Protein backbone atom coordinates (compact mmCIF):
# COMPACT_ATOMS: atom_id res chain seq x y z
CA UNK A 1 0.00 0.00 0.00
CA UNK A 2 1.50 3.39 -1.35
CA UNK A 3 0.77 6.93 -0.47
CA UNK A 4 -0.40 7.41 -4.19
CA UNK A 5 -2.64 4.60 -3.31
CA UNK A 6 -3.90 6.24 0.04
CA UNK A 7 -4.39 9.99 -1.57
CA UNK A 8 -6.73 8.22 -4.29
CA UNK A 9 -8.39 6.14 -1.46
CA UNK A 10 -9.21 9.51 0.01
CA UNK A 11 -10.14 11.11 -2.80
CA UNK A 12 -13.03 8.37 -3.83
CA UNK A 13 -14.23 8.14 -0.09
CA UNK A 14 -14.92 12.22 0.27
CA UNK A 15 -14.80 14.00 -3.12
CA UNK A 16 -17.82 14.64 -5.31
CA UNK A 17 -17.61 12.48 -8.37
CA UNK A 18 -17.64 14.53 -11.24
CA UNK A 19 -16.57 17.77 -9.06
CA UNK A 20 -13.01 18.60 -9.87
CA UNK A 21 -13.04 21.33 -7.35
CA UNK A 22 -13.62 19.15 -4.66
CA UNK A 23 -10.98 16.53 -6.02
CA UNK A 24 -8.63 19.36 -5.18
CA UNK A 25 -9.27 19.89 -2.16
CA UNK A 26 -9.43 16.41 -0.79
CA UNK A 27 -5.99 15.93 -2.41
CA UNK A 28 -4.79 19.26 -0.63
CA UNK A 29 -6.50 18.38 3.01
CA UNK A 30 -4.58 14.65 2.81
CA UNK A 31 -1.67 16.20 2.48
CA UNK A 32 -1.35 18.90 4.57
CA UNK A 33 -2.64 17.35 7.18
CA UNK A 34 -2.21 13.62 6.85
CA UNK A 35 1.27 13.10 4.12
CA UNK A 36 3.44 15.55 2.60
CA UNK A 37 3.55 14.98 -1.06
CA UNK A 38 4.74 16.59 -4.42
CA UNK A 39 1.37 17.77 -5.71
CA UNK A 40 1.78 21.63 -6.65
CA UNK A 41 -0.91 22.59 -4.22
CA UNK A 42 -3.22 25.21 -4.01
CA UNK A 43 -1.03 28.62 -3.47
CA UNK A 44 0.97 27.54 -6.68
CA UNK A 45 -2.38 26.00 -8.19
CA UNK A 46 -4.39 29.42 -7.86
CA UNK A 47 -1.19 31.07 -10.26
CA UNK A 48 -1.71 28.08 -12.57
CA UNK A 49 -5.15 29.02 -12.61
CA UNK A 50 -4.62 32.27 -13.34
CA UNK A 51 -2.19 31.71 -16.61
CA UNK A 52 -4.26 29.17 -18.10
CA UNK A 53 -7.56 31.23 -17.89
CA UNK A 54 -5.25 34.20 -19.38
CA UNK A 55 -4.00 32.04 -22.70
CA UNK A 56 -6.85 29.83 -23.03
CA UNK A 57 -4.74 27.18 -24.55
CA UNK A 58 -6.25 24.54 -26.95
CA UNK A 59 -3.66 22.03 -26.23
CA UNK A 60 -1.32 21.57 -23.01
CA UNK A 61 1.11 19.20 -22.54
CA UNK A 62 2.20 18.19 -18.77
CA UNK A 63 5.51 16.83 -17.94
CA UNK A 64 5.19 14.90 -15.04
CA UNK A 65 1.44 13.40 -13.88
CA UNK A 66 2.48 11.65 -10.51
CA UNK A 67 -0.97 11.58 -8.40
CA UNK A 68 -2.83 13.84 -11.64
CA UNK A 69 -3.26 17.14 -8.95
CA UNK A 70 -2.04 19.49 -12.21
CA UNK A 71 -3.91 17.13 -14.78
CA UNK A 72 -7.24 17.59 -12.73
CA UNK A 73 -6.77 21.72 -12.27
CA UNK A 74 -5.76 22.09 -15.37
CA UNK A 75 -8.34 20.28 -17.18
CA UNK A 76 -11.32 21.79 -15.35
CA UNK A 77 -10.58 25.15 -16.87
CA UNK A 78 -9.82 23.92 -20.62
CA UNK A 79 -12.68 25.02 -23.39
CA UNK A 80 -14.65 22.59 -24.82
CA UNK A 81 -12.86 20.60 -27.22
CA UNK A 82 -9.22 21.74 -25.76
CA UNK A 83 -6.72 18.63 -24.72
CA UNK A 84 -4.31 18.04 -22.12
CA UNK A 85 -1.87 15.77 -23.21
CA UNK A 86 0.11 14.13 -19.37
CA UNK A 87 3.58 12.23 -20.01
CA UNK A 88 3.96 9.18 -16.94
CA UNK A 89 6.84 7.33 -16.58
CA UNK A 90 5.84 5.60 -13.60
CA UNK A 91 3.01 3.23 -14.82
CA UNK A 92 1.43 3.11 -11.23
CA UNK A 93 1.35 6.67 -11.02
CA UNK A 94 -0.14 6.54 -14.70
CA UNK A 95 -2.80 4.44 -13.31
CA UNK A 96 -3.21 6.90 -10.27
CA UNK A 97 -4.07 9.63 -12.69
CA UNK A 98 -6.26 8.38 -14.69
CA UNK A 99 -8.87 7.08 -11.73
CA UNK A 100 -8.50 10.44 -10.43
CA UNK A 101 -9.28 11.83 -13.65
CA UNK A 102 -12.42 9.60 -13.65
CA UNK A 103 -13.53 10.58 -10.62
CA UNK A 104 -13.25 13.76 -11.61
CA UNK A 105 -15.10 13.37 -14.48
CA UNK A 106 -12.16 14.87 -17.01
CA UNK A 107 -11.15 11.69 -18.61
CA UNK A 108 -12.56 12.93 -22.15
CA UNK A 109 -10.39 15.82 -22.00
CA UNK A 110 -7.08 14.43 -21.14
CA UNK A 111 -5.04 11.52 -22.66
CA UNK A 112 -1.95 9.78 -20.55
CA UNK A 113 1.06 8.76 -22.23
CA UNK A 114 2.90 5.83 -20.42
CA UNK A 115 6.75 6.55 -21.06
CA UNK A 116 9.88 8.65 -20.73
CA UNK A 117 9.04 12.08 -21.56
CA UNK A 118 12.78 12.30 -24.24
CA UNK A 119 10.88 8.58 -25.89
CA UNK A 120 7.24 10.16 -26.08
CA UNK A 121 8.36 13.75 -27.48
CA UNK A 122 9.15 12.61 -30.92
CA UNK A 123 6.10 10.48 -31.28
CA UNK A 124 3.69 13.07 -30.41
CA UNK A 125 2.92 14.79 -34.02
CA UNK A 126 2.64 11.26 -35.59
CA UNK A 127 0.60 9.53 -32.81
CA UNK A 128 -1.51 12.01 -31.10
CA UNK A 129 -2.19 14.01 -33.99
CA UNK A 130 -0.36 17.23 -32.57
CA UNK A 131 1.41 20.09 -34.69
CA UNK A 132 2.63 22.79 -32.40
CA UNK A 133 1.90 22.98 -28.40
CA UNK A 134 0.45 26.05 -26.62
CA UNK A 135 1.39 25.74 -23.47
CA UNK A 136 3.88 22.90 -21.53
CA UNK A 137 3.64 21.93 -17.90
CA UNK A 138 7.10 20.89 -16.64
CA UNK A 139 6.95 19.09 -13.36
CA UNK A 140 8.80 16.06 -13.56
CA UNK A 141 12.47 15.03 -12.82
CA UNK A 142 14.32 19.00 -12.60
CA UNK A 143 17.01 17.58 -14.57
CA UNK A 144 15.07 16.80 -17.01
CA UNK A 145 13.95 20.48 -17.97
CA UNK A 146 16.54 21.64 -19.89
CA UNK A 147 16.70 18.79 -21.68
CA UNK A 148 13.71 18.21 -22.71
CA UNK A 149 12.87 21.83 -23.88
CA UNK A 150 15.39 21.66 -26.28
CA UNK A 151 13.98 18.39 -27.60
CA UNK A 152 10.42 20.15 -27.41
CA UNK A 153 12.28 22.55 -30.17
CA UNK A 154 14.04 19.94 -31.88
CA UNK A 155 10.97 18.21 -32.93
CA UNK A 156 9.01 21.32 -33.67
CA UNK A 157 6.78 21.85 -31.16
CA UNK A 158 6.99 25.40 -30.05
CA UNK A 159 5.67 28.22 -31.97
CA UNK A 160 5.71 32.01 -31.17
CA UNK A 161 3.73 32.75 -28.22
CA UNK A 162 3.80 29.20 -26.56
CA UNK A 163 3.99 29.38 -22.79
CA UNK A 164 6.33 27.13 -20.73
CA UNK A 165 5.18 27.39 -17.25
CA UNK A 166 7.97 25.73 -14.71
CA UNK A 167 7.11 24.56 -11.14
CA UNK A 168 9.85 24.06 -8.42
CA UNK A 169 12.56 26.30 -10.51
CA UNK A 170 13.60 28.01 -6.45
CA UNK A 171 13.20 24.33 -4.66
CA UNK A 172 14.17 22.05 -5.44
CA UNK A 173 15.75 23.94 -7.79
CA UNK A 174 16.10 23.81 -11.93
CA UNK A 175 19.23 25.89 -12.36
CA UNK A 176 20.29 25.42 -15.94
CA UNK A 177 16.87 25.08 -17.46
CA UNK A 178 16.39 28.44 -15.80
CA UNK A 179 19.67 30.26 -16.20
CA UNK A 180 18.77 28.99 -19.88
CA UNK A 181 15.81 30.38 -20.50
CA UNK A 182 16.55 33.60 -18.76
CA UNK A 183 19.48 34.25 -20.83
CA UNK A 184 18.46 32.88 -24.47
CA UNK A 185 16.66 35.61 -26.98
CA UNK A 186 14.49 32.80 -28.12
CA UNK A 187 12.18 33.21 -24.42
CA UNK A 188 10.75 36.01 -23.24
CA UNK A 189 10.39 34.89 -19.21
CA UNK A 190 8.55 35.97 -15.94
CA UNK A 191 8.35 34.93 -12.66
CA UNK A 192 5.63 34.32 -10.15
CA UNK A 193 6.78 33.88 -6.76
CA UNK A 194 4.71 31.55 -4.28
CA UNK A 195 5.41 28.73 -1.47
CA UNK A 196 6.46 25.59 -2.17
CA UNK A 197 3.70 22.92 -1.25
CA UNK A 198 2.28 21.26 2.21
CA UNK A 199 5.20 22.94 4.52
CA UNK A 200 3.66 23.18 8.04
CA UNK A 201 5.85 20.72 9.26
CA UNK A 202 4.90 19.01 13.00
CA UNK A 203 7.84 18.40 15.02
CA UNK A 204 8.04 17.92 18.90
CA UNK A 205 9.95 18.23 22.10
CA UNK A 206 10.03 15.40 24.39
CA UNK A 207 10.27 15.68 27.91
CA UNK A 208 11.78 12.78 29.87
CA UNK A 209 12.41 12.61 34.16
CA UNK A 210 14.92 10.61 35.07
CA UNK A 211 13.44 8.33 37.89
CA UNK A 212 16.56 6.65 39.27
CA UNK A 213 18.13 3.29 38.58
O1 LIG B 1 11.01 15.98 -7.38
C1 LIG B 1 9.88 16.57 -7.58
N1 LIG B 1 9.18 16.23 -8.65
C2 LIG B 1 9.56 15.17 -9.54
C3 LIG B 1 8.33 14.65 -10.22
C4 LIG B 1 8.26 13.46 -10.77
C5 LIG B 1 7.03 12.95 -11.45
O2 LIG B 1 7.20 12.99 -12.87
C6 LIG B 1 7.05 11.65 -13.42
N2 LIG B 1 7.75 11.60 -14.66
C7 LIG B 1 7.14 11.63 -15.90
C8 LIG B 1 7.78 11.57 -17.07
C9 LIG B 1 9.26 11.49 -17.09
O3 LIG B 1 9.91 11.34 -18.12
C10 LIG B 1 9.91 11.54 -15.79
C11 LIG B 1 9.18 11.57 -14.63
C12 LIG B 1 7.54 10.79 -12.22
O4 LIG B 1 7.26 9.40 -12.50
C13 LIG B 1 6.81 11.43 -11.04
O5 LIG B 1 5.41 11.11 -11.10
C14 LIG B 1 9.39 17.60 -6.65
C15 LIG B 1 9.96 17.66 -5.42
C16 LIG B 1 9.56 18.55 -4.42
N3 LIG B 1 10.21 18.65 -3.13
O6 LIG B 1 9.97 19.55 -2.40
O7 LIG B 1 11.00 17.77 -2.82
C17 LIG B 1 8.49 19.49 -4.68
C18 LIG B 1 7.91 19.37 -5.94
O8 LIG B 1 6.86 20.23 -6.27
C19 LIG B 1 8.29 18.47 -6.95
O9 LIG B 1 7.73 18.45 -8.13
MG1 LIG C 1 6.48 20.20 -8.44
Redesign the pocket.
Known amino acids: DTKEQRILRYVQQNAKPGDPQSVLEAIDTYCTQKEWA?N?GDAKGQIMDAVIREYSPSLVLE????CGYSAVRMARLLQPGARLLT????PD?AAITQQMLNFAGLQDKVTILNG???DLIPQLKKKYDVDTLDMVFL????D?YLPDTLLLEKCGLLRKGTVLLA??VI??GTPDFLAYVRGSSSFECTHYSSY??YMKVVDGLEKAIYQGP
Not at 63 to 66: R, T, V
Request: with cysteine.
Open positions: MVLGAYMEINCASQDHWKRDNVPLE
